[PDB]
From a paper:
The hook, a highly flexible universal joint that connects the filament to the motor, consists of about 120 copies of a single protein, FlgE23. We examined the structures of large inserts in the [name] sequence by solving the structures of [name] from Caulobacter crescentus (C. crescentus) and [name]. We solved the structures of both FlgEcc32 and FlgEcj79 to resolutions of 1.84 Å and 2.45 Å, respectively, using X-ray crystallography. Both FlgEcc32 and FlgEcj79 contain completely different extra domains that are not present in [name] from Salmonella enterica.
Numbering used by the authors: 94 to 819
The structure:
Amino acid sequence: VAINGDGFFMVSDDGGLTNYLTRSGDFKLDAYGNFVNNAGFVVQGWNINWDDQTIDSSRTPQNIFIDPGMHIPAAKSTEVAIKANLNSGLNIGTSSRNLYALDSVHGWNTKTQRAEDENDTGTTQFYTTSKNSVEVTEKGVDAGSLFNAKGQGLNLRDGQGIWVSYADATYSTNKVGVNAFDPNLQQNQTAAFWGTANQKVNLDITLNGVRIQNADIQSIDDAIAYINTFTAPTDTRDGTGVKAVKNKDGSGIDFVNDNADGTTDNMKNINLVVANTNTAGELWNAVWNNNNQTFTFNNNGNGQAGTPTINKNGSSLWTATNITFTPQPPQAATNVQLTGGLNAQIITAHKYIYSSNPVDIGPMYNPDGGPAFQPGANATTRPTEPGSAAYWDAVNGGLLNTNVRTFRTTEDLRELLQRDARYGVDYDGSGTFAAADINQNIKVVVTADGHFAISNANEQSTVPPNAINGVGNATTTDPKNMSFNITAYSNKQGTVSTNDAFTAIFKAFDGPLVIGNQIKESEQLKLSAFSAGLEIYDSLGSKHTLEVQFVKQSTTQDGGNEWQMIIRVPEPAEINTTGEGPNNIIVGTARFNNDGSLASYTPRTINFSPNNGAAPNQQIKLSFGTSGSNDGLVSSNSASTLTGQATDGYTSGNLKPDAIRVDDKGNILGEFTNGKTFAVAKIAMASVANNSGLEEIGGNLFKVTANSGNIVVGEAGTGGRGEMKT
């Protein structure tokens, strides 16, 4: 019942030629395929050409013919398109995936036993799980693109970072073991003197940049107590983070920094410098008067038994490494001389600072695997092989410093944490690096569940020959317990902001990790991810689903972002038969501009081989948008979501007769069993110059005259016409 108030006169015909006109629209399909009216007149229009599925309205109008039992063969996909958003912002909810797992060996896949760069975006490695799952592994990710378990962006910025303490910083003064002065020992003494009730000593030291001075020290407990006023900061004065306690005989001090307090350099580790004008706890000559029962004190001496000359020799009793009495103990000493310096720096904590710029932490020999250690010509010569040279540097003290550790990716940070736990901590508080400080079985990895994980297996290790300077044979090194303290990084000027979200990730490391089977893990790390299943059809019209996943790898502040695009097909189908990597998996990229528009994506086409009977090498075009536009893939600050997908392929199908209808454009719409809807025919609409000059012949039929003018045939919706209802 196709009617038209607007626009005039359908054409109608019986046999060839001889057309007629009617505004009556009571139309149906017969059992023989002809579109007719009740009078059996076949409506005139244009038929679809199935060879190109086009309707040519330019051709001469003829009988509209629609085979009722018409079968349309399946058509294979030549193109698939997607409309979707990839969240570029800081809230991704559950549209995420875990951080990729990482080896304990930098630049090396331990399972394949090959050299692979974890930070290279050109390299992508898969592994097969126990549940027969093919996952990406061994991939370092820009730390700027990290999320927590909640889907909240850590929003890490260049210059931000954290402190990681691996153990407590400790130092004991007076390691030379000179006894403390004893007022109850009624004889001359040359000892460590901390003052009496009647004699004061001068405390003069610099501790973590803070000068600690007191000339009113009358006991070691006074010194300890005064020093500990500097442990915590005041609103006007820095703290040291260093607590002091007197040793067993009260001859010296035991310092400890757990590095759990503060966010600045001055609150971490122990850097002690003693002034040469310090007298507190130094060497004094105590002379006894038997008559008066009193003591007198001097710290200079005269070069005579009981009052020997005291030569500090540019050192302090606190920090000296050697002490020498002259003459030898069989005779009373007339001179005592110290050897060493005035400072001691104990390092157990390091700062890890993020850089959005490229970072190469470099290769280093690792017993865990990879390249072998390659020594130089001798045990006193640095290696030329890069990883070996860096290993040489490490085991000779090259990491025991306060240098900034710069990282960009998760692999960078992982390996840096591992290297510092192994060679960057003064475990015995000596102020120097030795093989005793080597904790080489510490391993830092990232699990498949996205956690940083640290192990401390109770196993000895080996340092190869010619690695430690002057040591030409192998060295067995022992494991050490570790105690973690994690804080945010800042400066005293307050010009670097702290990142609580990022710091909280690694504060999960906090606590002791004793040698054994225990494992310290970080909080879970996530990535912005979005997956979609794109439907296609093979030559036989079977439906296949392209598994497409986008994971954001990096972002720039006003330069857009970049995603890894992974396409999977279930076996035995193939999309990567001739390329490297698995044959059912394609690895590509999708890059976006700062406005969220598509910049580029690759690949643009795939070569599909279903291997189910259908034809192979089915080239399928990927239509994910054009560069610079928002028509396909976009990455903007809103939830990752699929708007729609489409393909030009379809399975085989048949025409359902009773589902026929007509649009306002005169198109006869045929619905099929395959879900497709085609315009199988377009109804011709024709008008005349005059409408008042026409004759009623049949039932609402009109024939042309000389008064009407000849018939001009056109298409509804063009000119000033159109059709209605169904």
